[PDB]
Amino acid sequence: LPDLKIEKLEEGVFVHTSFEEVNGWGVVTKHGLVVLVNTDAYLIDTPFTATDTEKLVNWFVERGYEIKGTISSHFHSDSTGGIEWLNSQSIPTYASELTNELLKKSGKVQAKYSFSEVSYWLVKNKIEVFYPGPGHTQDNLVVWLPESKILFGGCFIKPHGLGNLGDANLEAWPKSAKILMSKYGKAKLVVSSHSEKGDASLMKRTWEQALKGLKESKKT
Ligand code: NA
Ligand SMILES: [Zn+2]
Ligand SMILES: [Zn+2]
């Protein structure tokens, strides 16, 4: 299993990359962020495992940062796998009320703190959590960093194909993708869960893939 990677994007923004075996043939790649406000650190998604969440936290703690909070972009384990471990360390975990309902329904440990607001400022003027509407999942969120114009699109941003449709809302995805394009056109960088980082055009590529997936589902 490849090791957790940490890469600096700019001052105050790091991408964490963790890996999971799909079964014998190679691995899934998952990107999240760590955002620094002075000496406060915020996890944007957890790695898949408690073990990789602890490695990630330990890397920032050793450099004099305090983990002030985590946000999970959706209920799937690639965003939420570390919540139980973070809770055991009394590190504040956040998810939307809908995300916590979906964790509870799937027999998973919930985030300690939840919110209902469509636009939720995890950190005033620094970290915005936004619900564009259903897509990859009913609850999928994005995270916007206004000072860097970095959008973390999580598993919503799907420039090359929508992936697993098990929990997806194909009827809503195109509308949700246009809402995102319309709000975050000033984005300098779009970081997705499962693809290479890109420019604002990844939001339009997602819209196109959403339209195509909906069209194909209506044919059969
Ligand atoms: Na450092
Ligand atoms: Zn997912
Ligand atoms: Zn994912």
**Residues flagged as binding site for Zn(2+):** 74, 76, 78, 136, 155, 194
User: What residue segments make up the domains of the chain, in order of their start?
Assistant: 5-219
Residues in binding site: 74, 76, 78, 136, 155, 158, 164, 194
Q: What angle do CA 194, 129, 11 make, to 5 degrees?
A: 70
Q: How far apart are CA 90 and CA 3, in angstroms?
A: 25
Amino acid identity, residue 166? G
Place of tokens 């406060």: 40
Round to whole Å and give the CA distance between 134 and 168.
8
Is there a contact between 101 and 95 (Cβ–Cβ < 8 Å)?
A: no
Q: Whole-angstrom Cα distance, residue 26 to residue 2?
A: 10
Where helices occur in the chain by DSSP H, the ranges are: 50-61, 77-80, 83-88, 97-105, 173-183, 201-219
3-state DSSP percent of the chain in helix, strand and coil, to 5: 30, 30, 40
Q: Please report where in the chains the tokens 């319309």 appear, as a residue.
A: 182
State the structure-solving technique: X-ray
**Domain 5-219 bears CATH identifier 3.60.15.10:** yes
This structure's resolution (Å) is: 1.9
**Cα 202 to Cα 158: distance, rounded to the nearest angstrom:** 8
d(CA 13, CA 192): 14
Beta strand 5-10 pairing with 150-154: unpaired
Ligand nearest to the CA of 153: 3
Structure tokens given for 149: 């114009």
**Catalytic annotation present for 76:** yes
